[PDB]
A paper describes a structure:
Given our finding that Flo11A-mediated cellular adhesion appears to be well-conserved in Saccharomycetales, we wondered to which extent structures are conserved. Therefore, the crystal structure of Flo11A from K. pastoris (KpFlo11A), a variant from the family of Phaffomycetaceae, was determined at a resolution of 1.40 Å. Despite a sequence identity between KpFlo11A and ScFlo11A of only 32%, their overall structures showed a high degree of similarity with an r.m.s.d. of 1.01 Å for 102 Cα atoms after superposition. The core motif of KpFlo11A, the FNIII domain, showed the highest degree of similarity (0.70 Å for 61 Cα atoms derived from the β-sheet), whereas the neck-like subdomain and the apical regions deviated from ScFlo11A. The surface of KpFlo11A exposed 6 tryptophans and nine tyrosines that cluster in two bands, which were similar but not identical to the aromatic bands of ScFlo11A. Also, both the KpFlo11A and ScFlo11A surfaces were quite rigid given the low thermal B factors found for their surface-exposed aromatic residues. Thus, the core and aromatic surface patterns of even highly divergent Flo11A domains appeared to be conserved, explaining the functional conservation with respect to cellular adhesion. Similar to ScFlo11A, KpFlo11A is able to undergo homophilic interactions with a KD of 31.8 µM. We also measured possible heterophilic interactions between ScFlo11A and KpFlo11A, where we found a clearly decreased interaction with a KD of 121.1 µM. Thus, both ScFlo11A and KpFlo11A are competent for efficient homophilic interactions in vitro, but they are able to clearly discriminate between each other.
Residue numbers in the entry: 16 to 192
Amino acid sequence: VPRGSHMSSGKTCPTSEVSPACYANQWETTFPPSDIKITGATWVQDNIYDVTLSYEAESLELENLTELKIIGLNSPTGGTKLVWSLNSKVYDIDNPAKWTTTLRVYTKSSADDCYVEMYPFQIQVDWCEAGASTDGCSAWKWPKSYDYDIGCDNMQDGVSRKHHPVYKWPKKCSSNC
């Protein structure tokens, strides 16, 4: 089957087992609606996994986008993952409203220790500045800059200060545990 390392389908998680690490009766609902989630995971080694993050959110157009980045990431490759940046010359999405990126992440054991989960992080969005097109920006009914907070915080009574949970998946991406 594979002709080297890091090409093995056998370290890939069942997608049915990649799911929210927590649930809440109330999440933060500031800023445009979004759906932010992990859709796939692959075990690298130890507590390190490669994952696919999927982002969908009400947006302006690519031309209006100044910067779009994941920050606060607990990762062996560092805490920032820019997917678009006019300043830093990163051009890795086609549409701010719907995109995916891959992240290499550290994990911790979940409350069910058949699973692991990633650590909290933020997605920062910046529109309409610093060289971006201003076309449509006056009509935008939301702030030009904002953060989505991702995490399973220490809730009381099911009330979270985060917009969305972090995700969990089976330890080692095993199908059976």
